[model samples]
Target chain A: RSKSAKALSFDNR
Target chain B: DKNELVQKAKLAEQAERYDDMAACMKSVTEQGAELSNEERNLLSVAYKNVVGARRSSWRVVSSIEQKTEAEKKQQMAREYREKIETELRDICNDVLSLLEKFLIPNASQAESKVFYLKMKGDYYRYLAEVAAGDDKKGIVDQSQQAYQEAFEISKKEMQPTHPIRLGLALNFSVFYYEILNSPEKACSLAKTAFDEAIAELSYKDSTLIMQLLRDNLTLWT
Candidate 1:
């Protein structure tokens, strides 16, 4: 994973 | 930890009689290597319950460092306003001095147009900053006038199509949104900035015009 972003595929909203 | 919301979600899952699964996940909270058999059993169940939410990955909790950030910011804002007012007073006096000194100049320079414009810009910027909280019509009008005067001087000095025009437009738009609370003016100037940028059509140009357009959405909305 990049430090700036994690690998996840979901919209919390 | 900043995981209060996540913890509450886990607690809700536990209340559903998913005790064993909840325990498993809870075990992850305190390192698994140090957990007792009973603790492991309970935490393992909880862990399963939380797994769906943690599809992102594993993470460890750290002690939260709380600070009164908002209070500190308010204090800073008050101090800045005081400092700005003092500086504006001194500048206004300096402009007046220039006007007096230039009183004997040639007919065209006698009135000191540059100093007058500087004074106008300073006065308007000051008024805009001071009228931030009050939403009264009069203050709003004064704020609009101030920004308009600043923009007018810049526009007159630099041609209407000059690079400085974009700077004036951006400054005016920001003043409208932030100090004047005039979203319509901000939106209008933002459109002008966009149109100007599109006209230029240079990929190397600054992205400020695009940013101004984006900011207008929030200001107008």
Candidate 2:
């Protein structure tokens, strides 16, 4: 997967 | 090896056992194979938990020790705190150096660069928290610079409403408000960030960022 995809999936609570 | 790692990770997570999850991820890293994006993120998460748990545990242990022998407890607590901080500083620096040398340099997109820079900023910020009095300022400054660079790069590379930019803006604003003790700058930055996010997100997409912004507004106002 793309970096943006990974970043977009980043769930920071 | 990968299959075993993924399975163990899932089981550890389901059990709410962060250390075990981290151990499973570490084993995957030890195999010296290319990691998938999910695996890399998992590894980072594991590192975060390992450090985070130790921090909390130290506080609990210190508080308990205070009940028994006050003078000795104080000295022990101070030593414990220093030990934890020293360990965290070493671990965070090692991971940051590794990412800087290998992972980030290989990443082609600004998305990846921003993510890694923000991660580095987080590490330095934590280090600043643990560092001694005068030493903290330099580390804090480095953290701020990293965050600023990440924000600017995200703005240039990503859409105004992209989640990555939105997240970075949220965090950077928080650093200003809480860490830097500048609520005015924080409020202004959050307002702009929230506006941009609102424009980009539908109701479903707005949940987390909206709540984050709302929480900040409540605190500021």
Candidate 3:
């Protein structure tokens, strides 16, 4: 189900 | 599965599958007052992720990194704007629902009400940013009204120099200039907010905030 695996970093900053 | 849904949603986010993340969190949001504090925060973040995904799509079309024909770029921008407008409306409604759960004016939960209204103001402002033509006025009006209500609440319930009041004023001023195209209103608000902040902090000797307030005032002058 994973796509890029690393592309989705949720950065609230 | 619902209990672990928050973590799973984060995994979905890690996978760059925002739609799945949104779906997962949507279930958790339905938990209502049953949600734990952490889950509530996650729900807010989940809504933000929806905007992030839509914004990513918008960026792909509008990014300067990839050069394209002028007509194609224009068409892409138009489509992206429409898509974002739809998504923003959903976001607005979702937050409105959340606000219903937390906001009860003049209730003992005054702090909670102010915080929720601040988020509501934020969401409406985002809607205003993407709105076009006739759609622009209604969304901007809603955005301003939300901010105004939040400002009134903070004034009544919060301290004179509370960051919430300062923030609402600053944000509303920016909206006046950038979105509503009213430099006069923006300048007026900037000056008033800064002067109020200065007066409130004068006795406290809050040097850092004082300097920052002075600098903010300088920009408008």
Candidate 4:
């Protein structure tokens, strides 16, 4: 429900 | 009316229509009602997809801008990069403003509160990515504060194995690692989460997030 894998990433990679 | 639009947004998400999904959510923010957790998820997912593409575009154009040899070409590339940056900043602030005004304030559940706060941290971090000088420093400070607050709440309200808690660990670590360039804090944050959740990875989402934390640990340590 929370934590968007797409928005939250390392260096946007 | 909001329910109808939310149903439409869900259908749009099912159909992979992020534009319509975004439109519905954006409208919901405009009319101003107490947002349910599901509505917040839809809104976050919609904007994340929308803003994510721009993030990639900016990264590519920014790289190209930095690599140019000719003054004229560099100037042109800078313009292109700045254009994308403008768009990115707009979307970031748009949702951030909505969170401040509606979504985050009405978030009642522990899950919803943590979700909105983490997302708030993320958009500020995104702005810090492109901003320079005093603006960048201020944005980064806001991001750290948001992340720190959510991380604290997740520990008290959520199980360590819950996806949201693990997500806080993952993202808070990256805030230290990437934004602040403090790998030591990043690794320590990640390690504590990994070790605590090692035996607690019961949820499918939690399992996947644990792997991501482990990957970061592998890279950092």
Candidate 5:
């Protein structure tokens, strides 16, 4: 429906 | 010492103690030394977690502000939302200043810079989401500029299937869709990334973001 800018999280090293 | 600090920051994150995570990362960043890609991501992870809930809390409060019919309660909600905005602005500024002063300038890796630039855009989008009038207009412009710059850099420095490249596209497209109210731009942006990346996706990370681009395309289109 709606969206927001994604602040991606890092997990893979 | 710094690397150990990064490890502790990592540990802090694993324990779900984001304040300690932020403290550990901030300790390293405050040294004003060049940060490795791992350190940079830790810095990003730390602050983003710290700021993450506030953004949602603000959203809920804003909804309540709209839904409540009683003038007194609505006024009270507005007052409380202002405090949330104040904290949100401070945290966003903190992350941005660190990125501008340390992370971006020190980053030699293409991926690190792309991530930092994307964070810049995301925080501005948060501000733009809640800001007002002339100030709102300015923050929205800044958000697009940040996203566009990151997107341009990603194309030159990263493959279509790179996680950061696809992630930037996903977030930038959302900025267009929700912040700028341009659904066509959003749809096209998301579609292009998904279409191009689908041909070459080779990793778990990029594939995850690609799904978001595709899902958003479905929603937006």
Candidate 6:
């Protein structure tokens, strides 16, 4: 879940 | 959840909960790659060492675990170094291919250094190897070139305090402190990272960039 969260953040960033 | 995890991991790192932070960071890799298989494996190997080292830090923090603590710490240090080296080997393989493709001019000058810094771990390691193999003068020459190349890239493509710059600073600091055994160099770069982050934050409050910079800079201190 956190990994997905990190991936999302990467995209957002 | 994944994004949250990464955020938390980064925050934990900023907070100096390097151990838990490492675990959280590891989750992103150890959990497996959601993308391609090759990408997933590479990520796992690269990130796992980053976390493993921090986990060792956390174990050392446990006050009651003194008996096994020293040995555990030692073991972790050796393994962590090995793992990171292996991971960087992977990165180097990628870089060689990238350089072959881009064929940037001044290949021996700037861009080669750029690729060296991107490994996120091995830049400093190679610097020391060059120094050790060469003489004292050679070491100085190698270190200066590496540092210059990294700073040049940061100066040109990124605002001094941008996230990308902060990332480069972190990599630089880690290399200086851990690989070069030059804490002063590490501290200098770390301060640059912190000052730049504080100065470059242009958005309004509540923006994560500010916090991210703060988090990333905490270790430098």
- The two-chain DockQ for each candidate, comma-separated, is 0.04, 0.03, 0.03, 0.05, 0.26, 0.03
lDDT of 2 at B198: 67
Return the number of clashes found in candidate 2.
Answer: 0
Docking tier of model 5: it is acceptable
lDDT of each: 0.44, 0.70, 0.63, 0.84, 0.83, 0.47
Q: How would you encode candidate 5's per-residue C-alpha lDDT over B14-58 as one tens digit per residue?
A: 999988998899889989888776776778788877887778888
User: For candidate 2, lDDT tens digit of each residue in B46-162?
Assistant: 767766666566556656556656677678777876677677777677657656666567557787778767777766766765665888788889889988999999878887576
DockQ-wise, the better of 5 and 6 is 5
Runs in model 4 deviating more than 4 A are A1-13
- CAPRI grade of model 6: incorrect
- Tell me which of candidates 1 and 5 scores higher on TM-score: 5
- Candidate 5 scores an fnat of 0.44
Please state the Cα-based DockQ of model 2 relative to the true two-chain complex.
0.03
Score every model by TM-score. 0.37, 0.76, 0.63, 0.88, 0.90, 0.40
Q: How large is the C-alpha RMSD of every model relative to the true structure?
A: 24.0, 8.5, 8.1, 6.5, 6.7, 12.4
Query: After best superposition, candidate 2 residue B205: deviation in angstroms?
Result: 7.2
> How high is the lDDT of residue B92 in model 6?
42
Q: Which regions of candidate 6 fall more than 4 Å away from where they truly are? A: A1-13, B1-91, B103-117, B120-147, B202-221
Model 2's CAPRI class? incorrect
Tell me the spans in candidate 3 whose CA falls farther than 4 Å from its real position.
A1-13, B1-29, B34-45, B52-73, B101-108, B187-221
| DockQ preference between candidates 3 and 4, better one | 4
Top TM-score model = 5
Candidate 3 lDDT tens digits, B48-97: 66765665565565453245546766676767666765776787677666
Model 1 lDDT per residue over B43-162, tens place: 323433333222222111100112323566657655654555454445433333332343112214311233233333433444344333553445446445644654666555643344
For residue B33, what is the lDDT in candidate 1? 28
Model 2 lDDT tens row, A1-13: 0000134765768
Top candidate on lDDT is 4
What TM-score does chain A of model 4 get? Answer: 0.23
